[PDB]
């Protein structure tokens, strides 16, 4: 059981909310590189921890991420002119650089120019995404390759969808092996075991766990191990396939919205391209998603669930495996009332995720280094994996690296 | 630097909100005359200071302005039948006249005489239906507004129902700095984009100048553009060589506003309604919907053309008012002035800020609300623009409104 | 100078039109292998040479291509039930197989020989290079299915963009044998640089020249012709020529100059006199060639954004192919997006069948004039017993191929010994 | 086998076509009563045999049917003012009455004798079982209007579904007189049998032909057959084997060479026969869901008649909903005039062959001065009906004494 209290604590990220402050202790993806386009390109809107952000790429190709509302009278910078090494607001011609310095003010003589600085965040570009450090400046750590993007020879293919529900349930969905055998029946293996035994192993960055199913052959002394990795506060590394690995990173746009990024990543000639990935997942922009990466599926059209399809044997009658997830997640409401839950042994990873985060948030709201920073970070040596193993090797012992070649 | 409380005091108008009661002391435009139509024409729904209203023209051709909801069981009168000197509710057949007197009650037999429905005194003028919405015994006699001398003048109005609070919209009216950037590609013999700002308080608001350096002779000359603020939310805008310009805003509620943009002057030099609308791109059925709501909106980024912008045009948006609309709206439903960062160009905005708070505070504690009485403006108050010698004061400049 | 006759002859394929009969001597791409889907999958409608076709994959996973209309009372088969080794009509239960045998008639007392006497027009089908092919010539004129010049064998990635263009085939192909246009029409797409090839990243194809007026040369051959466009390069055009060799494989295949990583082809299949299946292909090594979806997004021939369910283009004359007039003021040359979409806007506005009578060609057009002579010759010879052009021992194969290079002026482009871009080659 | 010539003759009805002249000898449904509305009600466009038509009910409530273009300068009368006992053209105010008399010309000093001088093409009309009928053949060949075989008298409920179909009339009737199809196409809708292969018989009459479909009954198959009897009343009526509670009827009127108005009727005792709206919902031929304002269907070739491919994989045979639409799909996809020349028929089409032969003869006969099939002494009467029962093979089905389902 959790309390309406702890639900609030684990879930809210807007404003003062602890989990928010804690989260901003990490680098965050603000948006996709493909959105910001060429030098001097169209400014893009984005949103993290309930703060509206412009992202533009100035003429020097530097990417800037700032408070959307211009420092003068609070008009939007998204309508601005990106040229000549700066974003210039439409109303009264103030022009900020990616750093947030105001280079000019077409309407003003004195020296207000030097002495006004606009909320701008240090940015970093990696693995097809635009990252920003959204917590206190002199706490920003240097940028390390995240677990699912070792270095820049790796192919990283991103699906992005802006989902209208709180982040926590979207992740709870990722560390739940039981469900692929149920939701993803008709989509997703050497085993037909529907009830996996679950084992956890706490770590410095989050945790590891295993789904132990009875394999199709020699269920006698063999186990089929599928092992997911939760990297706090909002990453999951999903059990890989024959050829590439799969990761989920979720960025809370606010209390009830979350940017959801589902990644394929491996050796470039074993890994799908971006546009292939999305077609598979049915998150293709303009067929599946609007121009903002908002799903055309929703409660109204019952996520295009096809009832005939279902009677024909197709399990969910919803096409694209994440869309199937979406259907479930979003019907749990804005913020899922964990208060009303009725968990079983299958939700072991889930109960770890709540315990761990509730832990690392109160701790943090009290002066502990926030879970997963400093000496402790996960790196590209931690990774999910799936194999068949003897019942007599520990799965934690298994010496797996991320799939490649 | 303003407090949150002041912004709330300056800005709110629904219910008892002081700025509300203050405004209701002036005559207020409720809607356009075009909307009301012929005698016995279709009822119009309109909204002022967070109160819903019917407007209908009866058989005699009297226009009324009443509470939208029937005095029986609060059904919408907008659905009623406007005929034979009354508006009759569909439901039970009660029939009010423009004055709010209940003439009949189809479904009942001395009640018909002793029930009044809220109606306000009304006046047509300059193509608008005006009402008085303050206490009945405070109603002035209707004087011409400073932008409609008498109705041999041509008054061509664009209306747009903007979904944001009233004040930020006027704030944009009194801001001569903005057109030097925003209306970069629409707007004058100068390119001084940073003009010295001068102000002069009055009994009815303020006059103010914007002192640009002219294309030639900015040794002993200033190009001066002067703008007049009539409280509570009216602004006389520097005219051009042919006709003058005015903006009056009526708060619909705390987060919405009727925005009337007016060209005015002599009928042979002032453009016609539809020409105006087409110019400012505020045409019903292309730029706006049947209720004068803009089809442009944040969802569609006001139809900004990003290529147009790479091709020289500053804003990418078409129709100088919509480029205004973009800014006003993006600041949010009520602009949080708390978080502002004003400069020398915003001197005019500050004056309004400061004057109106004085006025509302003064009024709240029982002063006559600013603009009433002896203190009124009338047609001789006006904006102007000319090249003025540096050795003359502009407050001195003796200018009347463009005509012939 | 061409004549109303010669045009009609060159262009029409419906009916007993010879250019039709000639064409049917080749294997024809009927539709995309992706359209037919799974065994017992929904049946696809298609159209070649003025004939309606059902294509389906049976329960054994065989692909049949047949006449669309049911042998019985001519109802559409595309509505029928594909199951248990056949396609069955909804009306009277007749069930054909991939071959054209009516294996059942549910209405008809099977106590008579009605079922074995009825044969329904089908064609021998083949699957290859991501496409379903059929032989729509006379039955025992059918050659063993040879690897096409742009799909060597099956270790090769082949990414296809399909677009059903609503004009005649011949203008579309004329488009592919025309190096001059790319320097005018595809100004803002094939942007000149200090390179040697034309990489991209959905960035741009490059090209080491800015010469818009290339010297043209031709070489007739058994299967059609090759030609070269000779551009002065940016650097040392003294004794160097940037060669770009396009190959025409008759009747309607264009081998287009490769870039750095992969090769480019075009194959057009006339649906009828005034419409044309246009397939535009990237092909080469699996790890250097774009995946299907990636290709389409670059070309803006994505189904459900650029094209509709049936691979028909959403851009048309009405919407002026989405011509962004602003973009044109701001620099982008055509103001239309996805470079084959630029081609289309032209080909289309020349009308259902270009009236080649009123043309006014230059030395830019030398390659097109070459296609016009050849095809009119080969069709005339064919109408008089001559083995249809590019069949038998005379066919192209995977050793014919386009190429680009800077070559010294004192080598003959015909002499250059090139192979299709692979990984090293 | 049939010939391009004959097909033409069977099918075309516009202009001078012989099948046109023959058809114009019978009373014709022009459109539903439900359309012409109250007196002074909005004028209705309609189209029979390639002639455009205005229908309107005047102040007295008489229903006129006229040529659509105003007699003056040929503007549409469908835009006209229907009041004060006349339809008045909007242009120059010429006003006609149902009978095609011009009562005034609002811009002419009509005080003399070129206001009566002008009649306007207008046909005699009758209201009956939900339908405005007109006789559009030559004046003096009009037979006094006898009750058709599916509406015995106006104490019957007659529930109609109308559908404007974009193909020639003939393939739409062929569809009605073809029992072979109900046990294949309508397999998941449509009986004490599972037999799909039934021995047909045909008997010609003066009005058309009767025939019997014979299925072996699910039980006692040795000396009993389940008889389904359909009656073709020419030119394009079909009486279709009834059910337990009501009878069925198809009449098709050619709008022209490549379109038909398809009227499909439920009829019987008022308390055993569906209401209009029920029928339409059952057949999915409801105006405003399935059909547009003009009874034109929203399912078409472009949207594959809403064929649900999954539903089919699920085992519902056609994956099209409402059994008439299963039919439409087939008929249309054959194309505007089925080229009967590429037909390859079998035993199951025995009836359709009868239809072909009869009509081809009856029109060559008509063209050479014989009476038009099933007119005068020859006509069908409400004594003619479709029937189905289980009968011994030792009664002649032709002889069976069945009457129309009622109670
Ligand atoms: O038909 C086409 O789309 C096409 C033809 C030629 C070339 C070229 O030679 O670069 C490119 C594209
Ligand atoms: S508000 Fe952005 S410059 Fe004035
Ligand atoms: S509420 Fe309007 S009369 Fe009853
Ligand atoms: S037409 Fe296909 S079986 Fe009757
Ligand atoms: S055409 Fe009808 S009256 Fe002139
Ligand atoms: Fe999932
Ligand atoms: Fe403005
Ligand atoms: Fe091209
Ligand atoms: Fe049927």
Cβ atoms within 10 Å of D119's Cβ, excluding its own = 12
Question: Looking at the DSSP assignment, which residues form a beta bridge with residue A193?
Answer: none
Task: Provide CB contacts within 8 A for C217, sequence distance 6+.
Answer: C227, C228, C230, C413, C414
Q: How far apart are CA D310 and CA B403, in angstroms?
A: 74
Q: How far is CA A392 from CA A199, A226, A389, A397, in A?
A: 15, 16, 8, 11
* Most C-contacting residue of D184, D213, D343 (CB-CB within 10 A), to test interface: D184
Q: How far apart are CA A316 and CA A304, in angstroms?
A: 11
Q: What are phi and psi of D281, to 5 degrees?
A: -70, -30
Q: Terminus-to-terminus CA distance in chain C, angstroms?
A: 42
Which ranges in chain D are annotated with CATH 2.102.10.10? 4-141
Contact A317, A309 (CB under 8 A): yes
Our CA-based measurement puts residue A62 at a distance from the nearest CA of chain B, in whole angstroms, of 19
Residue whose structure tokens are 């990722």 = A174
Q: Terminus-to-terminus CA distance in chain B, angstroms?
A: 45
Cis peptide before B377 (omega within 30 of 0): no
Q: Which of A78, A46, A100, A98 is nearest to B315 (CA)?
A: A78
Which ranges in chain A are annotated with CATH 3.90.380.10? 155-397
Residue whose structure tokens are 């004060």 = D84
CATH node for D157-399: 3.90.380.10
Strand ranges inside A35-151, DSSP E: 44-48, 51-57, 63-67, 81-83, 86-88, 94-96, 102-105, 120-121, 123-126, 129-133
Contact C209, C195 (CB under 8 A): no
Rg from Cα positions in chain B:
22
| Closest partner CB to B304 (pick from A79, A108, A112) | A79
- State in Å: Cα D380 to ligand 9 middle: 23
β-strand pairing of C224-231 with C253-256: unpaired
- For A11-23, b/e burial (b = at least 16 CB within 10 A) is bbbeeebbbbbbb
Q: Which of D363, D30, D404 is nearest to D170 (CA)?
A: D363
CATH architecture under which domain A4-139 falls: 3-layer Sandwich (2.102)
Q: Which of A41, A70, A43, A67 is nearest to A55 (CA)?
A: A43
Q: What six digits make up the tokens of B213?
A: 């350096």
Q: What are phi and psi of A170, to 5 degrees?
A: -65, -30
Q: From the alpha carbon of C343, which atom of ligand 1 is closest?
A: 3
- Between helix B166-173 and helix B4-11 the angle, nearest 10°, is 90
Contact A96, A54 (CB under 8 A): no
Q: How far apart are CA A163 and CA A180, in angstroms?
A: 20
* Dihedral angle of Cα A68, A70, A71, A75, to the nearest 10 degrees: -120
Smallest CA–CA distance from B341 into chain A, residue: A72
- State in Å: Cα D330 to ligand 3 middle: 57
- Say yes or no: CB of residue C259 within 6 Å of ligand 1: no
- Say yes or no: CB of residue C338 within 6 Å of ligand 1: no
Rg from Cα positions in chain C:
23
Q: How far apart are CA A31 and CA A38, in angstroms?
A: 15
Which ranges in chain D are annotated with CATH 3.90.380.10? 157-399
Q: How far is CA C264 from CA C347, C403, D115, D135, in A?
A: 20, 10, 77, 68
Q: Which of D375, D378, D373 is nearest to D18 (CA)?
A: D373
Question: Looking at the DSSP assignment, which residues form a beta bridge with residue C223?
Answer: none
Q: How far apart are CA B371 and CA C66, in angstroms?
A: 87
Cβ atoms within 10 Å of A85's Cβ, excluding its own = 15
Q: Terminus-to-terminus CA distance in chain A, angstroms?
A: 44
- State in Å: Cα D68 to ligand 8 middle: 52
Q: How far apart are CA C383 and CA B310, in angstroms?
A: 57
CATH architecture under which domain C157-415 falls: Alpha-Beta Complex (3.90)
Cis peptide before D68 (omega within 30 of 0): no
Residue whose structure tokens are 């990453």 = A235
> In which order are the strands placed within the sheet that holds A44-48?
A44-48, A51-57, A63-67, A120-121
The response to whether B266 counts as a known ligand-binding position is no
Question: Helix and strand tally (H, E) in chain C?
Answer: 9, 19
Q: From the alpha carbon of D89, which atom of ligand 5 is closest?
A: 2
Rg from Cα positions in chain D:
22
Q: From the alpha carbon of C75, which atom of ligand 4 is closest?
A: 1
Q: Calculate the CA C12 to chain-centre distance.
A: 17
Q: What six digits make up the tokens of B120?
A: 């306000």
Contacts of B341 in chain A (CB under 8 A): 71-73, 116
Q: What are phi and psi of D345, to 5 degrees?
A: -90, 165
* Dihedral angle of Cα D127, D129, D132, D135, to the nearest 10 degrees: -80
Contact D90, D96 (CB under 8 A): no
Q: How far is CA A4 from CA A328, A335, D289, in A?
A: 21, 11, 47
Q: How far is CA D290 from CA B298, C412, D95, D305, in A?
A: 37, 69, 37, 11
Contact D111, D117 (CB under 8 A): no
Resolution (A): 3.1
Most informative mutation of C177, C206, C256, C364 for ligand 1 (most atoms within 8 A of CB): C256
Q: Which of A144, A137, A136 is nearest to A374 (CA)?
A: A144
β-strand pairing of D86-88 with D95-96: antiparallel
Contact B64, B74 (CB under 8 A): no
Q: Which of D317, D324, D336 is nearest to D299 (CA)?
A: D324
DSSP A331: H
By three-state DSSP, how is residue D361 classified?
helix
Containing B47, the helix (H) or strand (E) segment is strand B44-48
CATH architecture under which domain A155-397 falls: Alpha-Beta Complex (3.90)
Which ranges in chain A are annotated with CATH 2.102.10.10? 4-139
Q: What six digits make up the tokens of D319?
A: 């994956």
Question: Looking at the DSSP assignment, which residues form a beta bridge with residue D55?
Answer: D44, D65
Residue whose structure tokens are 């007993």 = C16
Task: Provide CB contacts within 8 A for D279, sequence distance 6+.
Answer: D159, D160, D161, D266, D285
Q: What are phi and psi of D353, to 5 degrees?
A: -65, -40
Q: How far apart are CA B241 and CA B403, in angstroms?
A: 9
Q: Between C and D, how many residue pairs show a Cβ–Cβ distance under 8 A? A: 77
Contacts of A72 in chain B (CB under 8 A): 340-343
Classify domain D4-141 at the CATH topology level.
Answer: Rieske Iron-sulfur Protein (2.102.10)
Q: What are phi and psi of A137, to 5 degrees?
A: -50, -45
Q: Which of C65, C54, C68 is nearest to C24 (CA)?
A: C65
Contacts of D310 in chain A (CB under 8 A): 306, 308-309, 312, 314
Q: Which residues of C are annotated as a binding site for Fe(2+)?
A: 181, 186, 343
Containing B132, the helix (H) or strand (E) segment is strand B128-132
Task: Provide CB contacts within 8 A for B372, sequence distance 6+.
Answer: B25, B26, B140
Q: How far apart are CA C144 and CA A348, in angstroms?
A: 61
Cβ atoms within 10 Å of D158's Cβ, excluding its own = 21
Q: How far is CA D132 from CA D127, D278, D296, in A?
A: 5, 22, 19
Task: Provide CB contacts within 8 A for B249, sequence distance 6+.
Answer: B166, B169, B170, B173, B233, B234, B257, B258, B259, B260
Q: Taking CA B243 as the corner, what is the angle to CA B238 and CA B247, rounded to the nearest 5 degrees?
A: 50
Which ranges in chain B are annotated with CATH 3.90.380.10? 154-396
Which ranges in chain B are annotated with CATH 2.102.10.10? 4-138
B4-138: in CATH 2.102.10.10: yes
> In which order are the strands placed within the sheet that holds B81-83?
B81-83, B86-88, B94-96, B102-105
Contacts of C331 in chain B (CB under 8 A): 310
Cis peptide before C251 (omega within 30 of 0): yes
Cβ atoms within 10 Å of A76's Cβ, excluding its own = 24
Q: Which of B35, B60, B37 is nearest to B45 (CA)?
A: B35
* Most C-contacting residue of D7, D174, D176, D180 (CB-CB within 10 A), to test interface: D180
Contact A166, A255 (CB under 8 A): yes
Q: What six digits make up the tokens of A243?
A: 């050829």
Q: How far apart are CA B376 and CA B372, in angstroms?
A: 6
Q: How far apart are CA C226 and CA C361, in angstroms?
A: 20
Q: Which of C203, C198, C130, C162 is nearest to C296 (CA)?
A: C162
Q: What is the sign of the dihedral through the CA atoms of B136, B138, B144 and B147?
A: negative
Q: How far apart are CA D14 and CA D51, in angstroms?
A: 8
> In which order are the strands placed within the sheet that holds B44-48?
B44-48, B51-57, B63-67, B119-120
- State in Å: Cα A97 to ligand 8 middle: 41
Cβ atoms within 10 Å of C213's Cβ, excluding its own = 13
Cβ atoms within 10 Å of C4's Cβ, excluding its own = 10
By three-state DSSP, how is residue D25 classified?
coil
Q: Which of A36, A294, A251, A283 is nearest to A146 (CA)?
A: A251
Contacts of C302 in chain A (CB under 8 A): 284, 286-287
Classify domain C4-135 at the CATH topology level.
Answer: Rieske Iron-sulfur Protein (2.102.10)
By three-state DSSP, how is residue A237 classified?
strand
- For C307-331, b/e burial (b = at least 16 CB within 10 A) is beeebebebeeeeebbbbebbbebe
Q: What six digits make up the tokens of D173?
A: 């009737």
Q: What six digits make up the tokens of D264?
A: 């499909």
- For C247-260, b/e burial (b = at least 16 CB within 10 A) is bbbbbbbbbbbbbe
Contact C197, C219 (CB under 8 A): no
Residue whose structure tokens are 């609002």 = D106
Q: What six digits make up the tokens of A335?
A: 């913020």
- State in Å: Cα C239 to ligand 1 middle: 27
Q: How far apart are CA C361 and CA D302, in angstroms?
A: 41
Q: What six digits make up the tokens of D119?
A: 């009649």
Q: What are phi and psi of D355, to 5 degrees?
A: -55, -45
By three-state DSSP, how is residue B322 classified?
helix
Q: Taking CA D262 as the corner, what is the angle to CA D258 and CA D266, rounded to the nearest 5 degrees?
A: 170
Task: Provide CB contacts within 8 A for A42, sequence distance 6+.
Answer: A56, A82, B306
Q: Terminus-to-terminus CA distance in chain D, angstroms?
A: 45
Q: Which of C160, C159, C163, C180 is nearest to C172 (CA)?
A: C163
Question: Helix and strand tally (H, E) in chain A?
Answer: 8, 20
Cβ atoms within 10 Å of D261's Cβ, excluding its own = 24
Q: How far apart are CA C77 and CA C79, in angstroms?
A: 5
Q: Calculate the CA B343 to chain-centre distance.
A: 26
Contact C268, C173 (CB under 8 A): yes
Judged by CB atoms closer than 8 Å, whether chains meet at C327 and B312 is answered as no
By three-state DSSP, how is residue A339 classified?
helix
Which residue's C-alpha comes closest to atom 6 of ligand 1? C176
Q: From the alpha carbon of B73, which atom of ligand 3 is closest?
A: 1
Containing A250, the helix (H) or strand (E) segment is strand A244-252
Q: How far apart are CA A183 and CA C58, in angstroms?
A: 30
- Between helix D169-176 and helix D4-11 the angle, nearest 10°, is 80
By three-state DSSP, how is residue B23 classified?
helix
- What secondary structure does DSSP assign to C305-324, as a single string? TTB-TTS-BS--TTTGGG--
Structure-determination approach = X-ray
Contact B30, B65 (CB under 8 A): yes
Our CA-based measurement puts residue D310 at a distance from the nearest CA of chain A, in whole angstroms, of 5
Q: What six digits make up the tokens of A121?
A: 């965040």
B154-396: in CATH 3.90.380.10: yes
Q: Which of D242, D246, D386, D293 is nearest to D32 (CA)?
A: D293
- For B311-322, b/e burial (b = at least 16 CB within 10 A) is bebbbbbbbbbb
- Per residue, the 3-state secondary structure of B219-255, as one string, reads CCEEEEEEEEEECCCEEEECCCCCCEEEEEEEEEECC
Residue whose structure tokens are 């030639």 = B216
Q: How far apart are CA C50 and CA C53, in angstroms?
A: 10
Q: What six digits make up the tokens of A224?
A: 């089929």
| Closest partner CB to B308 (pick from C326, C331, C332) | C326
Q: Calculate the CA A149 to chain-centre distance.
A: 14
Q: What six digits make up the tokens of B274?
A: 């539809």
> In which order are the strands placed within the sheet that holds D122-123?
D44-48, D51-57, D63-67, D122-123
Task: Provide CB contacts within 8 A for A268, sequence distance 6+.
Answer: A153, A154, A155, C287
């Amino acid at each position: 059981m959790m309390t309406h209290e702890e639900n609030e604590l684990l879930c809210r990220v807007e404003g003062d909310a602890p989990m928010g402050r804690l989260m901003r202790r990490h680098w965050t993806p603000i948006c996709l590189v493909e959105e910001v386009g060429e030098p001097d390109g169209t400014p893009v809107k984005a949103r993290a921890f309930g703060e509206d952000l412009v992202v533009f790429r100035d003429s020097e190709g530097r990417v800037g991420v700032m408070d959307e509302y211009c420092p003068h009278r609070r008009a939007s910078l998204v309508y601005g002119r990106n040229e000549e090494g700066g974003l210039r607001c439409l109303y009264h011609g103030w022009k900020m650089d990616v750093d947030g310095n105001v280079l000019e003010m077409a309407s003003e003589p004195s020296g207000m120019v030097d002495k006004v600085k606009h909320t701008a965040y240090p940015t970093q570009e990696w693995a097809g995404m635009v990252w920003a450090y959204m917590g206190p400046k002199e706490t920003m750590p240097e940028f390390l390759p995240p677990a699912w993007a070792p270095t820049a020879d790796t192919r990283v293919s991103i699906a992005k969808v802006l989902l209208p529900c709180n982040w926590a349930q979207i992740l709870e969905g990722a560390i739940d092996s039981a469900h692929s055998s149920s939701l993803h029946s008709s989509d997703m293996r050497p085993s037909t075991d529907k009830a996996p035994r679950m084992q956890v192993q706490r770590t410095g960055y989050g945790f590891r766990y295993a789904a132990l199913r009875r394999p199709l052959s020699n269920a006698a002394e063999n186990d089929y191990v599928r092992s997911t990795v939760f990297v706090a506060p909002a990453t999951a590394l999903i059990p890989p396939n024959n050829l590439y690995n799969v990761a989920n990173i979720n960025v809370p746009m606010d209390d009830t919205n979350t940017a959801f990024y589902f990644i394929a990543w491996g050796h470039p000639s074993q890994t799908p391209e971006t546009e292939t990935w999305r077609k598979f997942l049915r998150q293709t922009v303009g067929v599946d998603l609007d121009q903002n990466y908002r799903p055309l599926r929703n409660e109204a059209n019952k996520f295009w669930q096809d009832r005939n399809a279902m009677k024909a044997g197709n399990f969910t009658g919803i096409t694209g495996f994440p869309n199937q997830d979406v259907a479930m997640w979003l019907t749990m409401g804005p913020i899922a009332d964990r208060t009303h839950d009725r968990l079983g042994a299958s939700d072991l990873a889930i109960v770890e995720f709540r315990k761990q985060m509730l832990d690392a948030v109160k701790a943090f709201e009290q002066g502990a280094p926030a879970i997963g920073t400093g000496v402790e970070a996960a790196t590209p040596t931690v990774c999910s994996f799936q194999a068949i193993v003897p019942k007599t090797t520990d799965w934690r012992t298994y010496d797996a690296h991320y799939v490649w070649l």
